[PDB]
């Protein structure tokens, strides 16, 4: 069955007026380079071309308050004059008074159109080359280059329109997705699962402690795989693959989702500036992480772009992910990755997360505690 891609050049229009491209890492060229890489590699010809649309204000209001959708979804004060000279709500999130409202709605709508085409069976899986990223946005607070939470809106719309009972949201963007967590913090029917640098709250945005397990009926359905200890050593492929083998897959498998949405951030890839990420994930590792998620929910999966700001890194990672969604055979993992053990900081983080969520997920016992094993050592003991 066909994989689907969605992309629109109107999202390029979301740009600061200052004319200083260096000051805004979330710039229009992040998706243009990605779409160009999908064309030159021939992957775009293997996928269906999905046309986007702007999200309706009622669609945005499933997640955000009406005052938030009217402030940032429409045009004729929270706005301020930035040091760069452009308008914005804060130093991070610039606002173009002409084009930005149509770009944010187009990003939410391209994700909703792709997710519904996969959920309804018009596509096997999808990948959304969309900007601005949405996972940091809250019910009324834009932040982190985010305005509307595109993944959260597509998840709420899957419930209110298709009555899906189980929805898995993986968030492997290096930053915690505070808005995707807040949107479903009390909902058993949606399992949020964020992998992020945390360092005891000393990283942006500072939320996402392992103890934050959800509330009310939704207790135990929010899994924060929070890494800690800084970049000493920085997390690599062996640490993320171990977190999937020990924490992500066992919990997602017991949840048995009907759908899998992914906040596909690429700022964890190697070569990023340290404040924006600092992890050394290979782009080839993200292709394997995509293929492991493809076994869930019958293959009903959609990846939506979030973070990731180095152009060569997000292009290599978008290529590996779409190549994985197509069923293409992966490049084999290097022997240094298969044999490397996770660093002790990643082991202390995984075991701390497993200690909290073993109370809620019965199958988080077989992996307690295999967190320190290398992938070859785990394949040895499982035989």
């Amino acid at each position: 069955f066909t994989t689907g891609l969605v992309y629109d050049t109107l999202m390029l229009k979301h740009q600061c007026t200052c004319g200083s491209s260096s000051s805004h890492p979330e710039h229009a060229g992040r998706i243009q380079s990605i779409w160009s890489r999908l064309q030159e590699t021939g992957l775009r010809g293997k996928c269906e071309c999905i046309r986007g649309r702007k999200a309706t204000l009622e669609e945005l209001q499933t997640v955000h308050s009406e005052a938030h959708t009217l402030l940032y979804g429409t045009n004729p004060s929270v706005f301020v004059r930035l040091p760069c000279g452009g308008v914005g709500v804060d130093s991070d999130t610039i606002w173009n008074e002409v084009h930005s409202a149509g770009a944010a709605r187009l990003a939410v709508g391209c994700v909703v159109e792709l997710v519904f085409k996969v959920a309804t069976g018009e596509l096997k899986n999808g990948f959304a080359v969309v900007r601005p990223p949405g996972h940091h946005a809250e019910e009324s607070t834009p932040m982190g280059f985010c305005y509307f939470n595109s993944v959260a809106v597509a998840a709420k719309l899957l419930q209110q329109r298709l009555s899906v009972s189980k929805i898995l949201i993986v968030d492997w963007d290096v930053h915690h997705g505070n808005g995707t967590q807040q949107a479903f913090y009390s909902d058993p029917s949606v399992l949020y699962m964020s992998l992020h640098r945390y360092d005891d709250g000393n990283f942006f945005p500072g939320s996402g402690a392992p103890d934050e397990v959800g509330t009310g009926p939704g207790v135990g359905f929010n899994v924060n795989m929070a890494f800690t200890g800084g970049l000493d050593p920085p997390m690599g492929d062996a640490e993320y693959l171990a977190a999937f083998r020990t924490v992500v897959m066992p919990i997602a498998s017991e949840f048995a989702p009907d759908v899998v949405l992914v906040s596909s951030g690429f700022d964890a890839v190697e070569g990023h500036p340290t404040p924006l990420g600092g992890y050394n994930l290979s782009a080839r590792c993200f292709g394997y992480l995509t293929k492991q998620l493809m076994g869930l929910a019958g293959g009903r999966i959609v990846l939506a772009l979030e973070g990731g700001y180095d152009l060569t890194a997000i292009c290599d990672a978008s290529e590996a992910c779409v190549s994985a969604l197509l069923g293409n055979e992966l490049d084999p993992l290097p022997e240094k990755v298969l044999q490397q053990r996770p660093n002790a900081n990643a082991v202390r983080s995984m075991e701390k997360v497993m200690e909290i969520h073993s109370k809620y997920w019965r199958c988080l016992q077989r992996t307690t505690s295999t967190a320190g094993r290398s992938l070859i050592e785990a394949q040895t003991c499982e035989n």
Partner: peptide, 12 residues
């Protein structure tokens, strides 16, 4: 006030 550009967490 923290920033995503600097990696600085939000705090009050």
């Amino acid at each position: 006030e923290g920033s995503i550009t600097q990696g600085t967490p939000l705090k009050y």
